[PDB]
Amino acid sequence: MIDAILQAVCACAAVEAHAKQLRLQRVCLGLAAYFASEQMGTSSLVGSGIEQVLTQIMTNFAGEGTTMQLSCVIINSIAMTSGDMYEEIKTSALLSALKTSVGKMATKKPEEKALKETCAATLEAASSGEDPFDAFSKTVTELDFKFTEWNVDPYP
């Protein structure tokens, strides 16, 4: 079931029309993060092109906070799950997009610098020389649901 719903949310996010529909991208990434962090659906994700979906929202909304956290949880999780699966998503593009995006993250307010830090470890962990299981071992690998804005309406 999970495999098949994760295949839909990846497909749903990769259609070019939906690229810039943030709130959607957010919840597709949300679900992706939940299952990845919870060690499920990781094969469905990578197979159904989670790589592309990530680079899309990381270059269409470079810097955006909520998408960056979810994206990094997914990566951190997949990195801590399978060696075969991580080196499949570890594409030049993703790396470029992750660095450029970390670059543009807001860095003034106290929780804004703290969030940057988290998403910056993933980038360090990605470009590290170290075996991924070592490199990503201390990085965040669980989902705080607040970053998915699941229950926040755009027009209260």
mmCIF file with all atom_site columns, N, CA, C and O in Angstrom, residues 40-88:
data_model
loop_
_atom_site.group_PDB
_atom_site.id
_atom_site.type_symbol
_atom_site.label_atom_id
_atom_site.label_alt_id
_atom_site.label_comp_id
_atom_site.label_asym_id
_atom_site.label_entity_id
_atom_site.label_seq_id
_atom_site.pdbx_PDB_ins_code
_atom_site.Cartn_x
_atom_site.Cartn_y
_atom_site.Cartn_z
_atom_site.occupancy
_atom_site.B_iso_or_equiv
_atom_site.pdbx_formal_charge
_atom_site.auth_seq_id
_atom_site.auth_comp_id
_atom_site.auth_asym_id
_atom_site.auth_atom_id
_atom_site.pdbx_PDB_model_num
ATOM 1   N N  . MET A 1 40 ? 10.282 2.837  5.763  1.00 0.00 ? 40 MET A N  1
ATOM 2   C CA . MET A 1 40 ? 9.343  2.202  4.856  1.00 0.00 ? 40 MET A CA 1
ATOM 3   C C  . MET A 1 40 ? 9.394  2.928  3.522  1.00 0.00 ? 40 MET A C  1
ATOM 4   O O  . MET A 1 40 ? 9.993  3.996  3.427  1.00 0.00 ? 40 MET A O  1
ATOM 5   N N  . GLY A 1 41 ? 8.846  2.281  2.490  1.00 0.00 ? 41 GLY A N  1
ATOM 6   C CA . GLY A 1 41 ? 8.655  2.868  1.168  1.00 0.00 ? 41 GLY A CA 1
ATOM 7   C C  . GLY A 1 41 ? 9.917  3.456  0.526  1.00 0.00 ? 41 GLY A C  1
ATOM 8   O O  . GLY A 1 41 ? 9.839  4.202  -0.453 1.00 0.00 ? 41 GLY A O  1
ATOM 9   N N  . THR A 1 42 ? 11.089 3.111  1.053  1.00 0.00 ? 42 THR A N  1
ATOM 10  C CA . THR A 1 42 ? 12.313 3.721  0.564  1.00 0.00 ? 42 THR A CA 1
ATOM 11  C C  . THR A 1 42 ? 12.595 3.227  -0.862 1.00 0.00 ? 42 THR A C  1
ATOM 12  O O  . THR A 1 42 ? 13.111 3.987  -1.664 1.00 0.00 ? 42 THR A O  1
ATOM 13  N N  . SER A 1 43 ? 12.203 1.994  -1.214 1.00 0.00 ? 43 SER A N  1
ATOM 14  C CA . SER A 1 43 ? 12.440 1.478  -2.555 1.00 0.00 ? 43 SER A CA 1
ATOM 15  C C  . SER A 1 43 ? 11.512 2.146  -3.569 1.00 0.00 ? 43 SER A C  1
ATOM 16  O O  . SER A 1 43 ? 11.919 2.476  -4.682 1.00 0.00 ? 43 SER A O  1
ATOM 17  N N  . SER A 1 44 ? 10.249 2.314  -3.176 1.00 0.00 ? 44 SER A N  1
ATOM 18  C CA . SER A 1 44 ? 9.274  2.986  -4.013 1.00 0.00 ? 44 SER A CA 1
ATOM 19  C C  . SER A 1 44 ? 9.739  4.404  -4.327 1.00 0.00 ? 44 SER A C  1
ATOM 20  O O  . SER A 1 44 ? 9.585  4.859  -5.458 1.00 0.00 ? 44 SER A O  1
ATOM 21  N N  . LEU A 1 45 ? 10.291 5.096  -3.324 1.00 0.00 ? 45 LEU A N  1
ATOM 22  C CA . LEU A 1 45 ? 10.665 6.486  -3.510 1.00 0.00 ? 45 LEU A CA 1
ATOM 23  C C  . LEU A 1 45 ? 11.751 6.577  -4.579 1.00 0.00 ? 45 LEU A C  1
ATOM 24  O O  . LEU A 1 45 ? 11.554 7.209  -5.618 1.00 0.00 ? 45 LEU A O  1
ATOM 25  N N  . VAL A 1 46 ? 12.873 5.895  -4.336 1.00 0.00 ? 46 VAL A N  1
ATOM 26  C CA . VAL A 1 46 ? 14.026 6.001  -5.209 1.00 0.00 ? 46 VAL A CA 1
ATOM 27  C C  . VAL A 1 46 ? 13.652 5.511  -6.604 1.00 0.00 ? 46 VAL A C  1
ATOM 28  O O  . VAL A 1 46 ? 14.024 6.125  -7.597 1.00 0.00 ? 46 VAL A O  1
ATOM 29  N N  . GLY A 1 47 ? 12.894 4.419  -6.676 1.00 0.00 ? 47 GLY A N  1
ATOM 30  C CA . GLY A 1 47 ? 12.474 3.880  -7.957 1.00 0.00 ? 47 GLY A CA 1
ATOM 31  C C  . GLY A 1 47 ? 11.515 4.793  -8.722 1.00 0.00 ? 47 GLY A C  1
ATOM 32  O O  . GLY A 1 47 ? 11.512 4.791  -9.953 1.00 0.00 ? 47 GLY A O  1
ATOM 33  N N  . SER A 1 48 ? 10.702 5.558  -7.989 1.00 0.00 ? 48 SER A N  1
ATOM 34  C CA . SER A 1 48 ? 9.711  6.425  -8.599 1.00 0.00 ? 48 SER A CA 1
ATOM 35  C C  . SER A 1 48 ? 10.239 7.849  -8.727 1.00 0.00 ? 48 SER A C  1
ATOM 36  O O  . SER A 1 48 ? 9.448  8.780  -8.831 1.00 0.00 ? 48 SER A O  1
ATOM 37  N N  . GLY A 1 49 ? 11.569 8.009  -8.687 1.00 0.00 ? 49 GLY A N  1
ATOM 38  C CA . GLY A 1 49 ? 12.230 9.271  -9.003 1.00 0.00 ? 49 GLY A CA 1
ATOM 39  C C  . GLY A 1 49 ? 12.092 10.349 -7.926 1.00 0.00 ? 49 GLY A C  1
ATOM 40  O O  . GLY A 1 49 ? 11.783 11.492 -8.234 1.00 0.00 ? 49 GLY A O  1
ATOM 41  N N  . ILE A 1 50 ? 12.346 10.000 -6.664 1.00 0.00 ? 50 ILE A N  1
ATOM 42  C CA . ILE A 1 50 ? 12.394 10.997 -5.609 1.00 0.00 ? 50 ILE A CA 1
ATOM 43  C C  . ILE A 1 50 ? 13.564 11.937 -5.897 1.00 0.00 ? 50 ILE A C  1
ATOM 44  O O  . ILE A 1 50 ? 13.539 13.089 -5.499 1.00 0.00 ? 50 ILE A O  1
ATOM 45  N N  . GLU A 1 51 ? 14.599 11.446 -6.587 1.00 0.00 ? 51 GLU A N  1
ATOM 46  C CA . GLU A 1 51 ? 15.770 12.265 -6.846 1.00 0.00 ? 51 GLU A CA 1
ATOM 47  C C  . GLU A 1 51 ? 15.299 13.553 -7.518 1.00 0.00 ? 51 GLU A C  1
ATOM 48  O O  . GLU A 1 51 ? 15.507 14.619 -6.956 1.00 0.00 ? 51 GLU A O  1
ATOM 49  N N  . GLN A 1 52 ? 14.585 13.425 -8.651 1.00 0.00 ? 52 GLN A N  1
ATOM 50  C CA . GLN A 1 52 ? 14.171 14.550 -9.478 1.00 0.00 ? 52 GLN A CA 1
ATOM 51  C C  . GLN A 1 52 ? 13.295 15.498 -8.676 1.00 0.00 ? 52 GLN A C  1
ATOM 52  O O  . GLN A 1 52 ? 13.506 16.696 -8.737 1.00 0.00 ? 52 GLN A O  1
ATOM 53  N N  . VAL A 1 53 ? 12.343 14.951 -7.917 1.00 0.00 ? 53 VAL A N  1
ATOM 54  C CA . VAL A 1 53 ? 11.370 15.743 -7.185 1.00 0.00 ? 53 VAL A CA 1
ATOM 55  C C  . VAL A 1 53 ? 12.087 16.686 -6.230 1.00 0.00 ? 53 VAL A C  1
ATOM 56  O O  . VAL A 1 53 ? 11.666 17.831 -6.063 1.00 0.00 ? 53 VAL A O  1
ATOM 57  N N  . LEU A 1 54 ? 13.148 16.161 -5.607 1.00 0.00 ? 54 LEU A N  1
ATOM 58  C CA . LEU A 1 54 ? 13.992 16.910 -4.691 1.00 0.00 ? 54 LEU A CA 1
ATOM 59  C C  . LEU A 1 54 ? 14.697 18.066 -5.414 1.00 0.00 ? 54 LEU A C  1
ATOM 60  O O  . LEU A 1 54 ? 14.601 19.213 -4.978 1.00 0.00 ? 54 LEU A O  1
ATOM 61  N N  . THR A 1 55 ? 15.400 17.788 -6.520 1.00 0.00 ? 55 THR A N  1
ATOM 62  C CA . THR A 1 55 ? 16.128 18.841 -7.214 1.00 0.00 ? 55 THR A CA 1
ATOM 63  C C  . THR A 1 55 ? 15.146 19.906 -7.701 1.00 0.00 ? 55 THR A C  1
ATOM 64  O O  . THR A 1 55 ? 15.449 21.085 -7.585 1.00 0.00 ? 55 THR A O  1
ATOM 65  N N  . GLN A 1 56 ? 13.974 19.508 -8.216 1.00 0.00 ? 56 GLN A N  1
ATOM 66  C CA . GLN A 1 56 ? 12.941 20.452 -8.628 1.00 0.00 ? 56 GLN A CA 1
ATOM 67  C C  . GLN A 1 56 ? 12.657 21.471 -7.526 1.00 0.00 ? 56 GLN A C  1
ATOM 68  O O  . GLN A 1 56 ? 12.853 22.662 -7.752 1.00 0.00 ? 56 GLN A O  1
ATOM 69  N N  . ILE A 1 57 ? 12.193 21.030 -6.348 1.00 0.00 ? 57 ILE A N  1
ATOM 70  C CA . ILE A 1 57 ? 11.776 21.988 -5.330 1.00 0.00 ? 57 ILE A CA 1
ATOM 71  C C  . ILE A 1 57 ? 12.995 22.699 -4.735 1.00 0.00 ? 57 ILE A C  1
ATOM 72  O O  . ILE A 1 57 ? 12.827 23.699 -4.040 1.00 0.00 ? 57 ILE A O  1
ATOM 73  N N  . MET A 1 58 ? 14.210 22.196 -4.999 1.00 0.00 ? 58 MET A N  1
ATOM 74  C CA . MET A 1 58 ? 15.414 22.792 -4.438 1.00 0.00 ? 58 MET A CA 1
ATOM 75  C C  . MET A 1 58 ? 16.006 23.831 -5.396 1.00 0.00 ? 58 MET A C  1
ATOM 76  O O  . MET A 1 58 ? 16.941 24.560 -5.040 1.00 0.00 ? 58 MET A O  1
ATOM 77  N N  . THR A 1 59 ? 15.479 23.887 -6.625 1.00 0.00 ? 59 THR A N  1
ATOM 78  C CA . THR A 1 59 ? 15.887 24.918 -7.562 1.00 0.00 ? 59 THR A CA 1
ATOM 79  C C  . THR A 1 59 ? 14.685 25.747 -8.012 1.00 0.00 ? 59 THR A C  1
ATOM 80  O O  . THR A 1 59 ? 14.885 26.791 -8.622 1.00 0.00 ? 59 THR A O  1
ATOM 81  N N  . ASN A 1 60 ? 13.457 25.335 -7.678 1.00 0.00 ? 60 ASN A N  1
ATOM 82  C CA . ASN A 1 60 ? 12.304 26.191 -7.907 1.00 0.00 ? 60 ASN A CA 1
ATOM 83  C C  . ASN A 1 60 ? 12.001 26.998 -6.642 1.00 0.00 ? 60 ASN A C  1
ATOM 84  O O  . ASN A 1 60 ? 11.404 28.064 -6.723 1.00 0.00 ? 60 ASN A O  1
ATOM 85  N N  . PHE A 1 61 ? 12.412 26.486 -5.476 1.00 0.00 ? 61 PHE A N  1
ATOM 86  C CA . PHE A 1 61 ? 12.242 27.176 -4.209 1.00 0.00 ? 61 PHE A CA 1
ATOM 87  C C  . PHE A 1 61 ? 13.526 27.047 -3.403 1.00 0.00 ? 61 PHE A C  1
ATOM 88  O O  . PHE A 1 61 ? 13.501 26.649 -2.235 1.00 0.00 ? 61 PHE A O  1
ATOM 89  N N  . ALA A 1 62 ? 14.642 27.376 -4.066 1.00 0.00 ? 62 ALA A N  1
ATOM 90  C CA . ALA A 1 62 ? 15.933 27.367 -3.414 1.00 0.00 ? 62 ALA A CA 1
ATOM 91  C C  . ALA A 1 62 ? 15.785 28.224 -2.173 1.00 0.00 ? 62 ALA A C  1
ATOM 92  O O  . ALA A 1 62 ? 15.177 29.286 -2.238 1.00 0.00 ? 62 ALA A O  1
ATOM 93  N N  . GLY A 1 63 ? 16.230 27.674 -1.045 1.00 0.00 ? 63 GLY A N  1
ATOM 94  C CA . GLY A 1 63 ? 16.211 28.383 0.218  1.00 0.00 ? 63 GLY A CA 1
ATOM 95  C C  . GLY A 1 63 ? 14.947 28.124 1.027  1.00 0.00 ? 63 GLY A C  1
ATOM 96  O O  . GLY A 1 63 ? 14.974 28.251 2.246  1.00 0.00 ? 63 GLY A O  1
ATOM 97  N N  . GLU A 1 64 ? 13.838 27.780 0.370  1.00 0.00 ? 64 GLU A N  1
ATOM 98  C CA . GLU A 1 64 ? 12.594 27.676 1.112  1.00 0.00 ? 64 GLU A CA 1
ATOM 99  C C  . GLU A 1 64 ? 12.833 26.710 2.272  1.00 0.00 ? 64 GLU A C  1
ATOM 100 O O  . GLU A 1 64 ? 13.503 25.683 2.110  1.00 0.00 ? 64 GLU A O  1
ATOM 101 N N  . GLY A 1 65 ? 12.309 27.091 3.445  1.00 0.00 ? 65 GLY A N  1
ATOM 102 C CA . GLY A 1 65 ? 12.646 26.445 4.701  1.00 0.00 ? 65 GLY A CA 1
ATOM 103 C C  . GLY A 1 65 ? 11.982 25.079 4.858  1.00 0.00 ? 65 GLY A C  1
ATOM 104 O O  . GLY A 1 65 ? 12.649 24.090 5.146  1.00 0.00 ? 65 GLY A O  1
ATOM 105 N N  . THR A 1 66 ? 10.659 25.037 4.679  1.00 0.00 ? 66 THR A N  1
ATOM 106 C CA . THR A 1 66 ? 9.908  23.838 4.998  1.00 0.00 ? 66 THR A CA 1
ATOM 107 C C  . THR A 1 66 ? 10.302 22.716 4.042  1.00 0.00 ? 66 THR A C  1
ATOM 108 O O  . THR A 1 66 ? 10.542 21.598 4.489  1.00 0.00 ? 66 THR A O  1
ATOM 109 N N  . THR A 1 67 ? 10.406 23.017 2.742  1.00 0.00 ? 67 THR A N  1
ATOM 110 C CA . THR A 1 67 ? 10.771 21.996 1.772  1.00 0.00 ? 67 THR A CA 1
ATOM 111 C C  . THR A 1 67 ? 12.203 21.526 2.038  1.00 0.00 ? 67 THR A C  1
ATOM 112 O O  . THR A 1 67 ? 12.501 20.343 1.873  1.00 0.00 ? 67 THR A O  1
ATOM 113 N N  . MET A 1 68 ? 13.068 22.416 2.506  1.00 0.00 ? 68 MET A N  1
ATOM 114 C CA . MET A 1 68 ? 14.488 22.011 2.669  1.00 0.00 ? 68 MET A CA 1
ATOM 115 C C  . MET A 1 68 ? 14.605 20.993 3.806  1.00 0.00 ? 68 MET A C  1
ATOM 116 O O  . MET A 1 68 ? 15.389 20.044 3.670  1.00 0.00 ? 68 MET A O  1
ATOM 117 N N  . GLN A 1 69 ? 13.845 21.186 4.876  1.00 0.00 ? 69 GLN A N  1
ATOM 118 C CA . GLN A 1 69 ? 13.957 20.267 6.031  1.00 0.00 ? 69 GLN A CA 1
ATOM 119 C C  . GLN A 1 69 ? 13.483 18.891 5.576  1.00 0.00 ? 69 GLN A C  1
ATOM 120 O O  . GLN A 1 69 ? 14.233 17.922 5.737  1.00 0.00 ? 69 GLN A O  1
ATOM 121 N N  . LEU A 1 70 ? 12.284 18.829 5.003  1.00 0.00 ? 70 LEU A N  1
ATOM 122 C CA . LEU A 1 70 ? 11.724 17.543 4.532  1.00 0.00 ? 70 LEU A CA 1
ATOM 123 C C  . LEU A 1 70 ? 12.734 16.894 3.587  1.00 0.00 ? 70 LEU A C  1
ATOM 124 O O  . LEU A 1 70 ? 13.054 15.713 3.781  1.00 0.00 ? 70 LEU A O  1
ATOM 125 N N  . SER A 1 71 ? 13.228 17.656 2.616  1.00 0.00 ? 71 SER A N  1
ATOM 126 C CA . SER A 1 71 ? 14.175 17.094 1.626  1.00 0.00 ? 71 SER A CA 1
ATOM 127 C C  . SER A 1 71 ? 15.358 16.466 2.354  1.00 0.00 ? 71 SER A C  1
ATOM 128 O O  . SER A 1 71 ? 15.765 15.359 1.980  1.00 0.00 ? 71 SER A O  1
ATOM 129 N N  . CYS A 1 72 ? 15.874 17.150 3.366  1.00 0.00 ? 72 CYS A N  1
ATOM 130 C CA . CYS A 1 72 ? 17.090 16.654 4.057  1.00 0.00 ? 72 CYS A CA 1
ATOM 131 C C  . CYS A 1 72 ? 16.743 15.423 4.898  1.00 0.00 ? 72 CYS A C  1
ATOM 132 O O  . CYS A 1 72 ? 17.556 14.498 4.929  1.00 0.00 ? 72 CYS A O  1
ATOM 133 N N  . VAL A 1 73 ? 15.573 15.403 5.529  1.00 0.00 ? 73 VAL A N  1
ATOM 134 C CA . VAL A 1 73 ? 15.163 14.182 6.277  1.00 0.00 ? 73 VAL A CA 1
ATOM 135 C C  . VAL A 1 73 ? 15.177 13.010 5.295  1.00 0.00 ? 73 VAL A C  1
ATOM 136 O O  . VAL A 1 73 ? 15.852 12.013 5.575  1.00 0.00 ? 73 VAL A O  1
ATOM 137 N N  . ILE A 1 74 ? 14.476 13.149 4.172  1.00 0.00 ? 74 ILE A N  1
ATOM 138 C CA . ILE A 1 74 ? 14.456 12.068 3.150  1.00 0.00 ? 74 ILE A CA 1
ATOM 139 C C  . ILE A 1 74 ? 15.900 11.642 2.881  1.00 0.00 ? 74 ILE A C  1
ATOM 140 O O  . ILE A 1 74 ? 16.206 10.464 3.060  1.00 0.00 ? 74 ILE A O  1
ATOM 141 N N  . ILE A 1 75 ? 16.760 12.579 2.502  1.00 0.00 ? 75 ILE A N  1
ATOM 142 C CA . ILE A 1 75 ? 18.155 12.212 2.131  1.00 0.00 ? 75 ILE A CA 1
ATOM 143 C C  . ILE A 1 75 ? 18.818 11.535 3.329  1.00 0.00 ? 75 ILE A C  1
ATOM 144 O O  . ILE A 1 75 ? 19.287 10.404 3.179  1.00 0.00 ? 75 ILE A O  1
ATOM 145 N N  . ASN A 1 76 ? 18.840 12.210 4.475  1.00 0.00 ? 76 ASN A N  1
ATOM 146 C CA . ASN A 1 76 ? 19.481 11.646 5.686  1.00 0.00 ? 76 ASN A CA 1
ATOM 147 C C  . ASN A 1 76 ? 18.978 10.221 5.885  1.00 0.00 ? 76 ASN A C  1
ATOM 148 O O  . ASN A 1 76 ? 19.804 9.333  6.122  1.00 0.00 ? 76 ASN A O  1
ATOM 149 N N  . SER A 1 77 ? 17.667 10.030 5.793  1.00 0.00 ? 77 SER A N  1
ATOM 150 C CA . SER A 1 77 ? 17.071 8.695  6.028  1.00 0.00 ? 77 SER A CA 1
ATOM 151 C C  . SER A 1 77 ? 17.549 7.708  4.962  1.00 0.00 ? 77 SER A C  1
ATOM 152 O O  . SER A 1 77 ? 18.092 6.660  5.335  1.00 0.00 ? 77 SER A O  1
ATOM 153 N N  . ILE A 1 78 ? 17.358 8.034  3.687  1.00 0.00 ? 78 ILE A N  1
ATOM 154 C CA . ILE A 1 78 ? 17.752 7.104  2.639  1.00 0.00 ? 78 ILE A CA 1
ATOM 155 C C  . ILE A 1 78 ? 19.242 6.769  2.774  1.00 0.00 ? 78 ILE A C  1
ATOM 156 O O  . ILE A 1 78 ? 19.640 5.610  2.656  1.00 0.00 ? 78 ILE A O  1
ATOM 157 N N  . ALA A 1 79 ? 20.064 7.773  3.070  1.00 0.00 ? 79 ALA A N  1
ATOM 158 C CA . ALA A 1 79 ? 21.482 7.561  3.308  1.00 0.00 ? 79 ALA A CA 1
ATOM 159 C C  . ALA A 1 79 ? 21.720 6.565  4.445  1.00 0.00 ? 79 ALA A C  1
ATOM 160 O O  . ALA A 1 79 ? 22.683 5.804  4.396  1.00 0.00 ? 79 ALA A O  1
ATOM 161 N N  . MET A 1 80 ? 20.865 6.575  5.480  1.00 0.00 ? 80 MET A N  1
ATOM 162 C CA . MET A 1 80 ? 21.057 5.704  6.633  1.00 0.00 ? 80 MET A CA 1
ATOM 163 C C  . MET A 1 80 ? 20.340 4.365  6.454  1.00 0.00 ? 80 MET A C  1
ATOM 164 O O  . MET A 1 80 ? 20.250 3.597  7.409  1.00 0.00 ? 80 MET A O  1
ATOM 165 N N  . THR A 1 81 ? 19.862 4.074  5.239  1.00 0.00 ? 81 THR A N  1
ATOM 166 C CA . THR A 1 81 ? 19.027 2.908  5.002  1.00 0.00 ? 81 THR A CA 1
ATOM 167 C C  . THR A 1 81 ? 19.714 1.891  4.093  1.00 0.00 ? 81 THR A C  1
ATOM 168 O O  . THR A 1 81 ? 19.864 0.732  4.453  1.00 0.00 ? 81 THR A O  1
ATOM 169 N N  . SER A 1 82 ? 20.061 2.304  2.877  1.00 0.00 ? 82 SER A N  1
ATOM 170 C CA . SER A 1 82 ? 20.704 1.400  1.942  1.00 0.00 ? 82 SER A CA 1
ATOM 171 C C  . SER A 1 82 ? 21.819 2.134  1.209  1.00 0.00 ? 82 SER A C  1
ATOM 172 O O  . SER A 1 82 ? 21.680 3.309  0.893  1.00 0.00 ? 82 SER A O  1
ATOM 173 N N  . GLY A 1 83 ? 22.936 1.425  0.995  1.00 0.00 ? 83 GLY A N  1
ATOM 174 C CA . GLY A 1 83 ? 24.078 1.957  0.274  1.00 0.00 ? 83 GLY A CA 1
ATOM 175 C C  . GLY A 1 83 ? 23.758 2.046  -1.210 1.00 0.00 ? 83 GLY A C  1
ATOM 176 O O  . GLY A 1 83 ? 24.038 3.049  -1.849 1.00 0.00 ? 83 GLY A O  1
ATOM 177 N N  . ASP A 1 84 ? 23.136 0.985  -1.729 1.00 0.00 ? 84 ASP A N  1
ATOM 178 C CA . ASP A 1 84 ? 22.673 0.940  -3.106 1.00 0.00 ? 84 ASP A CA 1
ATOM 179 C C  . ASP A 1 84 ? 21.727 2.118  -3.371 1.00 0.00 ? 84 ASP A C  1
ATOM 180 O O  . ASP A 1 84 ? 21.865 2.778  -4.397 1.00 0.00 ? 84 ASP A O  1
ATOM 181 N N  . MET A 1 85 ? 20.800 2.416  -2.447 1.00 0.00 ? 85 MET A N  1
ATOM 182 C CA . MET A 1 85 ? 19.753 3.403  -2.691 1.00 0.00 ? 85 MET A CA 1
ATOM 183 C C  . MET A 1 85 ? 20.287 4.836  -2.608 1.00 0.00 ? 85 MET A C  1
ATOM 184 O O  . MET A 1 85 ? 19.816 5.731  -3.304 1.00 0.00 ? 85 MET A O  1
ATOM 185 N N  . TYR A 1 86 ? 21.261 5.076  -1.732 1.00 0.00 ? 86 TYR A N  1
ATOM 186 C CA . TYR A 1 86 ? 21.750 6.436  -1.558 1.00 0.00 ? 86 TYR A CA 1
ATOM 187 C C  . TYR A 1 86 ? 22.556 6.854  -2.781 1.00 0.00 ? 86 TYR A C  1
ATOM 188 O O  . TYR A 1 86 ? 22.360 7.944  -3.311 1.00 0.00 ? 86 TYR A O  1
ATOM 189 N N  . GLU A 1 87 ? 23.446 5.972  -3.238 1.00 0.00 ? 87 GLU A N  1
ATOM 190 C CA . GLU A 1 87 ? 24.328 6.315  -4.346 1.00 0.00 ? 87 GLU A CA 1
ATOM 191 C C  . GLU A 1 87 ? 23.533 6.452  -5.649 1.00 0.00 ? 87 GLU A C  1
ATOM 192 O O  . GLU A 1 87 ? 24.109 6.835  -6.669 1.00 0.00 ? 87 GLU A O  1
ATOM 193 N N  . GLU A 1 88 ? 22.233 6.128  -5.621 1.00 0.00 ? 88 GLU A N  1
ATOM 194 C CA . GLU A 1 88 ? 21.384 6.283  -6.795 1.00 0.00 ? 88 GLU A CA 1
ATOM 195 C C  . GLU A 1 88 ? 20.828 7.700  -6.814 1.00 0.00 ? 88 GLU A C  1
ATOM 196 O O  . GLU A 1 88 ? 20.692 8.282  -7.895 1.00 0.00 ? 88 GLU A O  1
#
